[PDB]
From Swiss-Prot, chain A:
Plays an essential role in the virus replication cycle by acting as a viroporin. Creates a pore in the host endoplasmic reticulum and as a consequence releases Ca(2+) in the cytoplasm of infected cell. In turn, high levels of cytoplasmic calcium trigger membrane trafficking and transport of viral ER-associated proteins to viroplasms, sites of viral genome replication and immature particle assembly. The secreted form acts as an enterotoxin that causes phospholipase C-dependent elevation of the intracellular calcium concentration in host intestinal mucosa cells. Increased concentration of intracellular calcium disrupts the cytoskeleton and the tight junctions, raising the paracellular permeability. Potentiates chloride ion secretion through a calcium ion-dependent signaling pathway, inducing age-dependent diarrhea. Mannosylated. The N-glycosyl content is primarily Man(9)GlcNAc, with a small amount of Man(8)GlcNAc. The lineage of its organism: Viruses, Riboviria, Orthornavirae, Duplornaviricota, Resentoviricetes. The chain holds residues 95 to 140 of 175 of the full protein. It is found in: Host rough endoplasmic reticulum membrane; Host membrane, Host caveola; Secreted. Homotetramer. Interacts with the immature particle in the viroplasm. Interacts with host CAV1, early and late in infection. Interacts with host integrin ITGA1/ITGB1 heterodimer. Interacts with host integrin ITGA2/ITGB1 heterodimer. Interaction with microtubules blocks trafficking to the Golgi apparatus. Belongs to the rotavirus NSP4 family. This is Non-structural glycoprotein 4. A disordered 28 aa C-terminal domain is presented to the cytoplasm by each subunit of the tetrameric receptor. Ca(2+) binds at G27, Q30.
Length: 47, 45, 44, 46
């Protein structure tokens, strides 16, 4: 049945997109951590 | 200064990741809409 | 010597974005598995 | 109707995913640009 094949695909896509979402959130955390590093450099760049 | 180049890049990356996030959310909505389509098909046969 | 901390973060971001890339490519495959399903339905 | 509706959805998703892909590639470029910045910092450190 194609409807059962469609089901397997839909579940997989949901699962892929949820992972991409988790990774994206983890990336945004890293970007903040990168902003903090930029800041430390700026503080050191003055003295 | 490198530090100002780093700043421009960090800001850009955040902006890219926020877009990817919006698109991902939009995709999950579409996947639900696809689950609804699969259900209609199940009802039809 | 933060730079080592910056390094650890940059490597991790590279790793995260490469995963997102693999998943994105897997999604595009799926999107075509779906177009084939659409086609089978049309043939019906 | 459902078949054509499904088609709309699928085209939309393919478009969303291709954008995510472009952005991901742009992120990878930025990460390289960041590696280069780290290196410059290393050179300036000594």
């Amino acid at each position: 049945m194609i409807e059962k094949q469609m089901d397997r695909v839909v579940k997989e896509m949901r699962r892929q997109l949820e992972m991409i979402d988790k990774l994206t959130t983890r990336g945004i955390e890293q970007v903040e951590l990168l902003k903090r590093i930029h800041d430390k450099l700026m503080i050191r760049a003055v003295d």
